Amino acid sequence: MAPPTLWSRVTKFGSGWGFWVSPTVFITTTHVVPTGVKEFFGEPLSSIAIHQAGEFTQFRFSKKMRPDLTGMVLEEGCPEGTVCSVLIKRDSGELLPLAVRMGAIASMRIQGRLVHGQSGMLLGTIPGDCGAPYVHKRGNDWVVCGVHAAATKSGNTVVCAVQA
């Protein structure tokens, strides 16, 4: 369902993953971002516009890092009832797309503060999956609406972080 180009946007990053929204914009989950380094993907921090809001982190690079990609719409979450796919890659290379029905954008306590997020109920994630994108269609275009940030103890509910 997701073409290979879409999966190719999902990229190992820090303690999890992130997602190339366009040639210059990379999104990930805040808690997976390496701390105490001076460069991401070979580019010095001073050359990257970095925005972090709760568990959503966006990097905008000063050059086309992934020119093979078209730019995708990044939404600030999505409406309750949206069916999204979480494009989970595993370190072995296995692709694990999960279909989830989303709840409403709500306040969730993740790692010591409240952040914006949306719950999803699988219509089997692990900590290392954080940063995987939640995507869906807008007509024939793919849109991305958040990044994987948490899951319930039981496992039946996932949380994606969304922009504020």
- What are the chain's domains? 1-71 (2.40.10.10), 72-164 (2.40.10.10)
- Cα distances (angstroms) measured from residue 83 to each of 63, 95, 101, 114, 140: 33, 18, 4, 24, 15
Catalytic, out of 78, 84, 130, 160 = 130
In sequence order, what DSSP letters do the residues of 53-117 get, joined into one string? ETTEEEEEESS-S-TTSPP-EE-S---TT-EEEEEEE-TTS-EEEEEEEEEEEEEEEETTEEEEE
Q: Is there a catalytic annotation at residue 55?
A: yes
SS3 145: strand
Q: Round to whole Å and give the CA distance between 142 and 14.
A: 25
Contact between 126 and 148 under an 8 Å Cβ cutoff? The reply is: no
Burial label for 157, CB within 10 Å (0-12, 13-18, 19+), is middle
CA contacts within 13 A on the Cβ side of 91: 8
Is 78 annotated as catalytic?
no
Rounded-to-integer distance, Cα 123 and Cα 129, Å: 18
CB of 57 within 8 A of CB of 27?
yes
Where b means 16+ CB within 10 Å and e means fewer, 27-65 reads: bbbbbbbeeeeeebeeeeeeebeeeeebbbbbbebeeeb
- Resolution (angstroms) equals 1.5
Q: Structure tokens of 149? A: 């940030």
Elucidation method: X-ray
**Residue 76 designated active-site:** no
